[PDB]
Design a protein around this ligand. Structure first.
Ligand SMILES: [Zn+2]
Lengths: 177, 37, 71, 156, 146, 94
RNA sequence: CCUACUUCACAAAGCGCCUUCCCCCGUAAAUGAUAUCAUCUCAACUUAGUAUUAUACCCACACACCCAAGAACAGGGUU
């Protein structure tokens, strides 16, 4: 409050840079978060015509995780336009080809199907690994919590935690195991 | 293999195994008994 | 950072929400051709090319030059 | 009843403990007294208020203009009290009614600045291949009210 | 637990064996899960629970030895398969796409080239139906098919 | 003057200098300009929030496109607060 | 593409000549639990097993005349 008109408007309608870490995250949940931010539906001043979308930088998109057998079952379909140009590629093959395609397509499908969609997609920055360009890193403002909490492995559990968990059963001594 | 909607063991050595998503009747003694679901 | 309190009769809710200042420790010191043009502008402003192309006289004359102003 | 700590052993949302009623009442009294003292000392600038007028709720402040979509049976320039004030708020505190604040707390006053008719609204009915076409023009009465002041009293 | 050692001469020696923790919450139960009040409160990612029924190389232990109910043995087996496919048991191995809740073996599912019409869509299974009865903490039921 | 802003009515130059003068009159040291929040620093539409601190205490912060503009406008906010002509001040009584 | 031959003739053609490069998966195995044997495994895991086509091609911001470039335009050359 007490700002001048132009600075106040600039602050209100400024676009913020968010960071998502895609490691072990479902591309769909990443895409939901990113699509909300790209549309600007996270802002109370939101309106379809106010162009109030924000920048989303998703890193480690190479390390996304699909639930179920989606890596093998989910099929991405495209057509080159030419006869016989129908191409159907499983998620695993598409991921091996382009380590950004799966998250990009998820976000593209979640965004509203209008002319603003590609302007929004211009504000989406996908990076396969931990590396991010220096200018993007300097732009970053906030990091969004990962939608899925990564379960711990036994190798990661501490011996104290293992001990704290009770033993469930008495194994017979005379067993090879 | 022979494609069958219902798999039936024929001799004693015909064994059912679910491989690559579907059931098979394999048989060492009588490979004629090979069946695929 | 809000304090909620019903009044004694329980008919009005009182919310105390003072504005919290940013700690000094949470701050940093102040540091001390058409095709290519449209590509450059699109890259600069993270938009698509379509925004930057001109519009016909019909659209330009349709635009309102004295729009109402509020506040 | 002890269940070993697993992913599904306890609800994902954090468990919540009801504060002891004695301390809850003490804290409530402290907050209410503090805000009442702020009101007494006039430690507030602009006040806004959500006020239920006509059929709608208006977010209002002093000097604001409000367009009611109906005539009010009031001469222009006549001063009025808006009695259904749902919310009154300042920079540092807000008071919420359940659902309405008491008359003793808040006094929102307005003035009938204008009595007008809305611009002509067109009602057009058309059905294809039925020779069904009807046109009507309706102008709604309107009253512009200016909110003059919002006063609060230390009656908490 | 007996282990066989070779030197040829081979012999079996019984080594240290863990025991059930003291004070089960529900003594006198059919299965360990019931004894410890875990009927519907463990998931594929509960490695601490799952590994207690796992051979050192990753295989499941027989139901006779474990004492588990039939249904609970099936649930544990399926949860263990899912944990292995999710990579949560890196040390229980015989000797790169991140997954989880994988019902089927990755090499046995064919791609869904022709998903059907809206009323006959071919859905991608997620998780296991064996866990359908788990504790529901969500307003909507958790979907087994995506 | 209803709805008007202090410096929309009273045109000033170098609000930072004017604020320094006022703080000298009040025997307060020169405020420290410090970057509270930032966004899109390297882009063509940055957002900078610059706050003025008096003895590690925030007196006023302001937004802007460049750091200089944000600092200038934070000085303007500080002047408004000192003069008591803030936006959320008590309305005029009629 | 035109050296020859042939239709022909400052060139266009074939009837003439030149060049054309990786795979796809059905199964067959290894170790191995559920079910201490066995078991290719919609168990974990190890091979045949590979598309993540490999490449190659193209990439110079800014009159007139002639041309193997061409309907116009465009393109190339004019030292
Ligand atoms: Zn047989």
């Amino acid at each position: 409050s007490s700002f001048s008109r132009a600075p106040q408007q600039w602050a209100t309608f400024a676009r913020i840079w968010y960071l998502l870490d895609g490691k072990m995250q479902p591309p769909g949940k990443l895409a939901a978060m990113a699509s909300i931010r790209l549309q600007g539906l996270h802002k109370p001043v939101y309106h379809a015509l106010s162009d109030c979308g924000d920048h989303v930088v998703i890193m480690n998109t190479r390390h996304i995780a699909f639930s179920g057998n989606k890596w093998e079952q989910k099929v991405y379909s495209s057509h080159t336009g030419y006869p016989g140009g129908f191409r159907q590629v499983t998620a695993a093959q598409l991921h091996l080809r382009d380590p950004v395609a799966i998250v990009k397509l998820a976000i593209y499908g979640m965004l509203p199907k209008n002319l603003h969609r590609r302007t929004m997609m211009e504000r989406l920055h996908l990076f396969p690994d931990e590396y991010i360009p220096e200018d993007i890193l300097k732009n970053l403002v906030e990091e969004l919590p990962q939608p899925r909490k990564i379960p711990k492995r036994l190798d990661e559990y501490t011996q104290e935690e293992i001990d704290a968990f009770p033993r469930l059963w008495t194994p017979p001594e005379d067993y090879r195991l | 293999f022979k494609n069958k909607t219902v798999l039936k063991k024929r001799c004693k050595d015909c064994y059912l195994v679910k491989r690559r998503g579907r059931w098979y009747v394999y048989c060492k003694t009588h490979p004629r008994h090979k069946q695929r679901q | 950072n809000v304090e909620l309190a019903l009044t004694s009769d329980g008919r009005t809710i009182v919310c105390y929400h003072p504005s919290v200042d940013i700690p000094y420790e949470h701050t940093k010191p102040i540091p001390r051709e058409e095709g290519p043009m449209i590509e450059q502008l699109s890259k600069m402003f993270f938009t698509t090319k379509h925004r930057w192309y001109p519009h016909g006289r019909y659209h330009r004359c349709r635009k309102n030059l004295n729009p109402p102003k509020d506040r | 009843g002890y269940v070993p700590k697993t992913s599904l052993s306890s609800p994902p949302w954090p468990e919540v403990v009801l504060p002891d009623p004695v301390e809850e009442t003490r804290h409530h009294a402290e907050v209410v007294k503090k805000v009442n003292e702020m009101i007494v000392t006039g430690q507030y600038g602009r006040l806004f208020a959500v006020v239920h007028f006509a059929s709608r709720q208006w977010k209002v402040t002093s000097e604001d203009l409000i367009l009611i979509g109906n005539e009010l049976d009031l001469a222009c320039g006549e001063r009025i009290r808006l009695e259904k004030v749902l919310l009154v708020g300042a920079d540092n505190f807000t008071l919420l009614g359940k659902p309405l604040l008491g008359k003793d707390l808040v006094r929102v006053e307005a003035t009938v600045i204008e009595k007008t008719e809305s611009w002509p609204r067109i009602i057009m009915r058309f059905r294809k291949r039925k020779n069904f076409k009807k046109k009507r023009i309706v102008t709604t009465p309107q009253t512009v009210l200016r909110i003059n002041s919002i006063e609060i009293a230390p009656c908490l | 637990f007996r282990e066989v050692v070779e030197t040829t001469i081979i012999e079996g020696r019984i080594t240290a064996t863990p025991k059930e923790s003291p004070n089960p919450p529900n003594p006198s139960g059919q299965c360990p899960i019931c004894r410890w009040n875990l009927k519907h409160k463990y998931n594929y990612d509960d490695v601490l629970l799952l590994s207690q029924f796992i051979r050192p190389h990753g295989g499941m232990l027989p139901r006779k030895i474990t004492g588990l109910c039939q249904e609970e043995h099936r649930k544990i087996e399926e949860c263990v398969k899912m944990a292995h496919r999710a990579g949560l048991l890196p040390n229980h191995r015989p000797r790169q796409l991140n997954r989880y809740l994988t019902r089927w073996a990755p090499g046995s599912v064919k791609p869904i080239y022709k998903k059907g019409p809206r009323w006959n869509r071919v859905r991608m299974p997620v998780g296991s139906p064996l866990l359908r009865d788990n504790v529901c903490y969500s307003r909507t039921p958790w979907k087994l098919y995506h | 003057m209803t709805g008007k802003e202090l410096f929309e009515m009273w045109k000033i130059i170098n609000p930072m200098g004017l604020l320094v003068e006022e703080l000298k009159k009040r025997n307060v040291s020169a405020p420290e300009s410090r970057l509270t929040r930032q966004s899109g620093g390297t882009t063509a539409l940055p957002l900078y929030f610059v706050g003025l601190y008096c003895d590690k205490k925030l007196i006023a912060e302001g937004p802007g496109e460049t750091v200089l503009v944000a600092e200038e406008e934070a000085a303007r906010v500080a002047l408004r607060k000192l003069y008591g002509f803030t936006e959320n001040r008590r309305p005029w009584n009629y």
